[PDB]
Write an enzyme that holds these catalytic residues in place. Sequence first.
Site, short mmCIF file in Angstrom:
data_model
loop_
_atom_site.label_atom_id
_atom_site.label_comp_id
_atom_site.label_asym_id
_atom_site.label_seq_id
_atom_site.Cartn_x
_atom_site.Cartn_y
_atom_site.Cartn_z
N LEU A 100 0.89 -0.55 -12.13
CA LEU A 100 0.16 -0.77 -10.89
C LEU A 100 1.02 -1.56 -9.92
CD1 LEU A 100 -3.40 -1.62 -12.28
CD2 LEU A 100 -2.64 0.51 -11.23
N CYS A 131 9.45 -4.10 3.30
CA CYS A 131 8.53 -5.18 2.94
C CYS A 131 7.14 -4.92 3.51
CB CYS A 131 9.07 -6.52 3.45
SG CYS A 131 7.96 -7.93 3.15
#
Lengths: 410, 410, 410, 410
Positions: A388, A174
Amino acid sequence: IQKEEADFQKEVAEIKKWWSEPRWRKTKRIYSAEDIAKKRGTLKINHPSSQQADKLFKLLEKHDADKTVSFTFGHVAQMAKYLDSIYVSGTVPNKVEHLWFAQLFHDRKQREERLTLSEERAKTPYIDFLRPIIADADTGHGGITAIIKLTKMFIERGAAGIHIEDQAPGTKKCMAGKVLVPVQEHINRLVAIRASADIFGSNLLAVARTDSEAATLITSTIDHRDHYFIIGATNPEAGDLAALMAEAEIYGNELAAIESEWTKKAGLKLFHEAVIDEIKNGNYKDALIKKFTDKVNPLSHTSHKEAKKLAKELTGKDIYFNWDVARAREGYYRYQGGTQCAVMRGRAFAPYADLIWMESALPDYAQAKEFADGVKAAVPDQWLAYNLSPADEQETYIKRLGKLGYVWQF
Amino acid sequence: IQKEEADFQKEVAEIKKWWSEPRWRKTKRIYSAEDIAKKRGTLKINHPSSQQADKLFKLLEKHDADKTVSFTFGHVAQMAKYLDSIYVSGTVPNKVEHLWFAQLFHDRKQREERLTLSEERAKTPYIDFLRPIIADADTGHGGITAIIKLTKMFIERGAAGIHIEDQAPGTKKCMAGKVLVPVQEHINRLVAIRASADIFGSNLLAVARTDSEAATLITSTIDHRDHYFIIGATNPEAGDLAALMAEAEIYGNELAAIESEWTKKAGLKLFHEAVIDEIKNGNYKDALIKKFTDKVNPLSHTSHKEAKKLAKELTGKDIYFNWDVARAREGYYRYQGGTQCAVMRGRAFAPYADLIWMESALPDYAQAKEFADGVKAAVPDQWLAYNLSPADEQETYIKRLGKLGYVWQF
Amino acid sequence: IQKEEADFQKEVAEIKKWWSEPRWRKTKRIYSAEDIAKKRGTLKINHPSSQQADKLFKLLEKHDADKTVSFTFGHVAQMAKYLDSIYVSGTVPNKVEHLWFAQLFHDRKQREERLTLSEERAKTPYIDFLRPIIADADTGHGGITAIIKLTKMFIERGAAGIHIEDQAPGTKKCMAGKVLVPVQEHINRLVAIRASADIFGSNLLAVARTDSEAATLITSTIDHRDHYFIIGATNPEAGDLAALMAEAEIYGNELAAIESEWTKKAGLKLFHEAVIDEIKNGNYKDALIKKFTDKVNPLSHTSHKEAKKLAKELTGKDIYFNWDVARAREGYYRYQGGTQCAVMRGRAFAPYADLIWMESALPDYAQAKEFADGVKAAVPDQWLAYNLSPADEQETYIKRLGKLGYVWQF
Amino acid sequence: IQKEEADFQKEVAEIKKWWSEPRWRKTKRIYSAEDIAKKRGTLKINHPSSQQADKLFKLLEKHDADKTVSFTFGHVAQMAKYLDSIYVSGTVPNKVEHLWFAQLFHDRKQREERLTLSEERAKTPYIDFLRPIIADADTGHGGITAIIKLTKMFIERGAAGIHIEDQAPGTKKCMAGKVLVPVQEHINRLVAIRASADIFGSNLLAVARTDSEAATLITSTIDHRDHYFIIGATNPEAGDLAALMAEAEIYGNELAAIESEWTKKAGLKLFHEAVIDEIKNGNYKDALIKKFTDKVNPLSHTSHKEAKKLAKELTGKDIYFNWDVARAREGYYRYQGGTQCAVMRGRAFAPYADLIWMESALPDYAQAKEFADGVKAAVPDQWLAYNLSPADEQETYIKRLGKLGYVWQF
């Protein structure tokens, strides 16, 4: 007995014919048709996911011929008005099956509504709910049998395409950089996907994404093609980072200082960078540096031993380079990556994947241009995908990327 | 605000008290009670799996005190007449939940039948269907979050104990030796299991099995404790096996010959074996060999660099030892293993696991005796588990193994 | 033996004490505490759904005391800022479990974020993700064992309340009126839900919804309380509708004409309506009609035989009334329903349900007022729920309904 | 538009052709091919369960021609050496899918083993793991949509046949007689199964089992074909049983006495039995009784009103017969049943079911003989199935039953 051999030979013949259509014009298979036929059962099972894969392949062919982008996105009513395909990612097989059932139900309802109407159909719009589904196969995490079973599950649950990454399984964070697998490991996963599709008799598309541009670690140095991008220490007096942190395990906020001190002590450079910065100290200039760069480049697949041999032949000394002391706590080697590593990985993955997918931390037209140029210079007719990481001039940027060769973006 | 801090402090206090009972007499925790309390939610949830884990721990304590074996096996009616626990292995969480529901249903039915009867109960036998369940946590295959979630699922589904192996995830074969992970990786998995159990507030037992005796490969050399058992090549003129097979990829039946030729060309020996066989060539004899063996032994946790330094101090030369050229195609290093490696791994895993499990290819009393002696010489009060890979004197053999210290066999 | 009886008696005592708190102040149980204790197992299992049910009961008590509505709705982030509870309906147990896991995960994340912060917590808002969940138990469709197992599943999966309807199982249509079950069938389902909650030891709330206002059919005439609202034919010369359609099975568009002709031929009236329209033909006027209406009213629970006896005593003739010829093709009797039938059903369901739920085809303040007045005149402290079938003055309408006694609306 | 109509017409034509093969030689369809085509989607999906159903139909044809029994049973290795089919009953769709996957896996493994062997195959035995599966569709319990979805699920999960019963949903008890549905309800369920199979384009076999022989209750009297077997009270002075038990709800052990007293007070007889026992009291003898029995028989489908009219024409009086006072607490009418009711139900179900299944409490050759004779006298080419509720002369009994017409037993 005789009928068994007869049907086996007929199955081999039909598999060989199946591999002759323009669908597999650029597909490299390491398995023979005999192996695929032997892997099949006595009951031929057809999947609608094969038809969806055919539809997706035809759509991508049309977009590649027209140099147009196929818009995608990660509600089935508006998922077919504005999209040509749906990419599913995080379980994931359950999402694919649920979406496939929803699409089938909506198509059934639409056909029931239309067929009961006999003039008024022209006014009523038609919605093609049967959008091909791209499935993210990131739930395996171990070996080759897992990806085989995952491919079987995706084919059975209506997936028209399967996407896998060269990122190390069970390493997503994360994020302090991604961890890669060797090129051959991802190639083996792609080959397993193709073999599973052949066993199930499906035209399922294989989509390969390379995460090398933002990656900072690699699991192994076993592949020569990665040896160019592996970071090592040029200081012979620097010890192992993992051992240093094990024997000095002080608060982590202060361990960040020991890590910084070690990183400054040992110059973390690529081997070509090391020999370049060493050859600048002492004239021998342009000719030998140029020939070394030509023979040792990111797209040369040169092993580190061969690079050291060439440097010794040119420079005349054994350049110190130890990438073991730079390993992480869990043993991951430091990896450079970059756009050229992505180009090399895409070129290696092209024979085994219908779509080559490049990730980008930020939108840069030059990076996409150079990746597309490299991949289409190695393999000309290779479809490309762009995305992206998670203005108004996005339309022209998408059009330019489509003109580059990217036929699948979201 | 004030009530929130009050209940947080009360939770920290109750966690600290929970860690004071004889249940955690030999449990090593790297996390503080504050971290465990912060990981918990605002709703305290209790699981019957915690009671089952308490029952299993008490049973194992009784068997260890009595030096008796707890029989186990991989039909709930006869699974409680002859067994004290059930081990579940291959999905696996689904099997555990189904077995837990079956046990609860049978216990409910038995109590309904007994309570409706008021003298005749004494004649009616009682069956304790609530047998503690050992769950095999081999479905993670990636990182630490997967084992955390797997532990949560096992606790929620009634598992009283969780078993994990140090075998490399996604490497089991139907078999050319097992592939190990570094000792620290398995220790981290055990710590993650314990942390998850603390977060869920369960007394779940951690069972660690070492597969080093039959293992032939290791994923990484990052752990010093493994450096003693890593196989390397003593021939400087031998190239990499993986590169040789890549550049010579001839039929596999003939590649088996190239592999044999390479294996004979380079003497595959352990570093201590290499220095022993080299020190026999040239007198310097007993004293230095003995001191090297005392300082470089399987239970010394000596890094390979330290071993090379000691050999250079004693022998006087840099003994060549390259374990990179002996790597497999996927990059796995050659690993020796043996019983002493199993003893070292069990000693390392003892602080983090309630049960230490040793696998055996064949039944050998001497191997079990030496493993038990080593583990109980390092950690005296360490419970041990024994099993054989898949006569009438098996009863006395089981009794002897129980007297050794093995309190859980199947 | 002795310990078994001791713990059984202790369990009976704790169940009896559990039934003494104000939670069960108006709960009618047909089972003894001994039966509930015998139905339980030897392992006491506690569910967080019991705590959620306690929270919901306290919330409803506060709203009833304050005469305020508890807003509800059929995204967990905004499901706790604006709501006090969530109603789940269509599988449904899977939705409840998924929502419960999401709520627990969000609560855990919020507490982790808050506890790591030590002043800045006051600025950070607090969100109570642990919203009690109302589960729709409409997936049984058969008998009493199905609703028992469904209640067990809902309790295990975090449901704080269970909602059931008196609509006939497997009769919902996409709609020519709803089909009801007899009052006793719904009462039995409510009793089964309460017994299952007692067995699991949960404070789960029972919510009963009556669909009699819009209903047009009833499965059976076995319950006297329904006999007032059953539609019959007053024409002795009219045959059975089902037989007529079976022997004349012409196009359905033309069968709609045969049905209309039969419906006009036989006056479809309630028995009290029949005797009222017959007693107007021939003076005997006000006194006997008034006494019949007082003794035969929707809230009198008078069997049809008793009504016929009273009519014979008053009018002097046997009024023809055959409700069998008016049955549907599948055997469902024609049912009147209305608001008074809803009041009767709510009064009958009040002893067995914490919440009495009335459905409305359209928003009518008078209908809600009369339903609330009837239910709270029979059972004063009975919580009520209101909803509309799927402007700006909705706020004051909701406030008025809350002042009526409706404490749960959506 | 034009292509849509073209493919719709082609689909209608292919459905009509599909209904012309000897597979549907005795299949009665109430839906047109246009409705089935409109119910289908735009993606034609083929299921291997259709091939399994074809295999099962061919096997049953061969057994019927050879007058031989197809052995069945409720481990896939020995489930194909000794069996021709597998019946799955209790969830059930999950069992069917798991068994189908196991069969496919074993077939795949067997073909892999055989094809890799090239002489030695003759010695190696062949096992046909692809045994057709009969699925018990008893998990619907409500309406017609549930059985439609259940048929869809069974077809998708590899079921070659679907079995349903005329027993009332949600009424099975651990047993005071079974509760039946009207004949038309079971016929509607069979028609729904056939329509679902046609929509999915499968040759799935429909198996109908009648439980009328051991049944004692019926949900409704709406079907005339059941009116002969409905038990009523011949005593005008007897009140309703349900009302009597409601107003006298004394211990159940003493309520068993009130039930017995009521049962003795009112003679519970069939209407034909009532008129027979009444016509014996007063000569009018053989001729009128014989003509009434000929016109009012179990296989006459005579409504109760027509029977009363015939009795009034013959006997001259209105025979009292009230079956409402004999209803159970939940409203189920008392039902006689017997073998003749089973024959009537099987004759009614024959046009809609490939297999007619008769249940037996005990093995009686005469009962099976008379059932087979009745069913094959109404519909000659009707396949029959036999089973017993849960010696050495069982082989000859099975052979005799197969010679009767039973081609599927277990």
